[PDB]
Design goal:
This is part of a larger assembly, with chains A and B.
Chain A (H helix, E strand, L loop, with lengths): L1 H30 L15 H11 L10 H17 L17 H10 L2 H8 L4 H28 L10 H5 L11 H14 L14 H7 L2 H25 L10 H23 L7 H29 L8
Chain B lengths: L29 H38 L2
The chains are: A mainly alpha, B mainly alpha.
The structure holds 1,2-Distearoyl-sn-glycerophosphoethanolamine.
PDB class: oxidoreductase
Keywords: NADH:ubiquinone, oxidoreductase, complex I, mammalian, mitochondrial
Entry title: Entire ovine respiratory complex I
Chain lengths: 318, 69
């Protein structure tokens, strides 16, 4: 019964990754004024299976790793984190209801970078090293800021439960009480994934994803997996945190529907932002975070420490 | 015969080269006015709902404390 629950959670996020990649290719296609894949199956529904079994079957391809340990560690870690992140996300019901919750997601999201340190470490290519160190740097710098945001927007919940969030949302979406901090936290969600503008790239550039996206073949179908699945997550955790629907018990699938729709549309907006804008150069990015985001986050935060005591509504910890 | 070279009756009508990038009028500071306004709504409503939730809190603790003996 319980392993049934686990399987029903984790298999559909993988299928969700495949057909997500489909929707990505299409939305970018028409956004670019051209039809996406039609010629694999009808309408493009066989495209993932192509990508899937082929991209699995192309042979391992290079080089001496120098560490047999890490090379087969990092993918397992990246997946395992990407799969367990989905546990607390509320849904009508969490599948594990944790008192703390959201800071558990915050915590594992903080662990997610060892796959980049180790992945980029075992290349034996001294350039992919440097690239990896840098990607760790930007991911980590946006692990600073984001944490403070959750530590603010949550302060209108009154507890970490991640369930009571759906209780706060009943009257008004949390986007209204703070829009700006929600804006900064959206862009923050673009950060770690390194969607455009924040992505690094091919041609001439730091090429972190040059060997990172190149190397490890099938295990690149893994890093591929954890990256897209992690995307769908951060979209969902946005949908839960900064907005949400009314939960009518006796009919949970109603809230499940509405939740699903808004989340999917949000991810759609990721893929079309990536279409939309150019990339920042690296330093302008890092100290764009240090220049402006983090100070204004501090301001809004202290204003949310002082605010609820002003208006005399401070939230009811259960 | 006559000659089949192209040019028609003159001018092909007018053509517009010059740049055009107009029309955004919603922006004075008043954009701030509507956003900040939205905040001013959010804190109102959310204030109310947190008060209500406190009321419920006391009521629940009353359930427990009436149970205790
Ligand atoms: C060479 C490397 C070998 C290892 C490789 C490992 C790969 C995967 C690493 C990443 C995964 C880390 C997972 C950590 C899980 C932490 C769980 C946790 O903190 O849950 C919080 C929850 C709090 O419960 P609460 O809501 O307060 O109460 C319930 C109602 N009273 O708590 C509970 O409900 C209680 C749960 C207790 C269960 C025991 C937890 C044991 C954790 C062992 C971790 C081992 C791996 C360490 C990480 C390695 C990282 C490289």
């Amino acid at each position: 019964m319980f392993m049934i629950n686990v399987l029903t959670l984790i298999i559909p996020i993988l299928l969700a990754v495949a057909f997500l990649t489909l929707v990505e290719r299409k939305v970018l296609g028409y956004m670019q004024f051209r039809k996406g894949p039609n010629v694999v199956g009808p309408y493009g529904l066989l495209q993932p299976i192509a990508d899937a079994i082929k991209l699995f079957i192309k042979e391992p391809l290079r080089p001496a790793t120098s560490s047999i340990s890490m090379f087969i560690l990092a993918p397992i870690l990246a997946l395992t984190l990407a799969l367990t992140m989905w546990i607390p996300l509320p849904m009508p019901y969490p599948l594990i209801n944790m008192n703390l919750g959201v800071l558990f997601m915050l915590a594992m999201s903080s662990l997610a970078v060892y796959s980049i340190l180790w992945s980029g470490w075992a290349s034996n290519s001294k350039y992919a090293l440097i690239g990896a160190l840098r990607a760790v740097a930007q991911t980590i710098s946006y692990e600073v800021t984001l944490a403070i945001i959750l530590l603010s927007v949550l302060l209108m919940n009154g507890s970490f439960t991640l369930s009571t969030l759906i209780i706060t949302q009943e009257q008004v979406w949390l986007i209204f009480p703070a829009w700006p901090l929600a804006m900064m936290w959206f862009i923050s969600t673009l950060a770690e994934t390194n969607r455009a503008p924040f992505d690094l790239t091919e041609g001439e550039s730091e090429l972190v994803s040059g060997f990172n996206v190149e190397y490890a073949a099938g295990p690149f179908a893994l890093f591929f997996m954890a990256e897209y699945a992690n995307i769908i997550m951060m979209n969902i955790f946005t949908t839960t945190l900064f907005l949400g629907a009314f939960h009518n018990p006796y009919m949970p699938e109603l809230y499940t529907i509405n939740f699903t729709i808004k989340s999917l549309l949000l991810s759609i907006t990721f893929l079309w932002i990536r279409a939309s804008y150019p990339r920042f150069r690296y330093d302008q990015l890092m100290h764009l975070l240090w220049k402006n985001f983090l100070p204004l986050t501090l301001a809004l935060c202290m204003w949310h420490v002082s605010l609820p005591i002003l208006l005399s509504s401070i939230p009811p910890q259960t | 015969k006559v000659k089949q070279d192209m040019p028609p009756v003159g001018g092909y009508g007018p053509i517009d080269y010059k740049r055009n990038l107009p029309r955004r009028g919603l922006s004075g500071y008043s954009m701030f006015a509507v956003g900040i306004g939205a905040l001013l709504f959010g804190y109102w409503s959310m204030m109310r709902w947190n008060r209500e939730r406190r009321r419920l809190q006391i009521e629940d603790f009353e359930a427990r404390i009436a149970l205790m003996p």
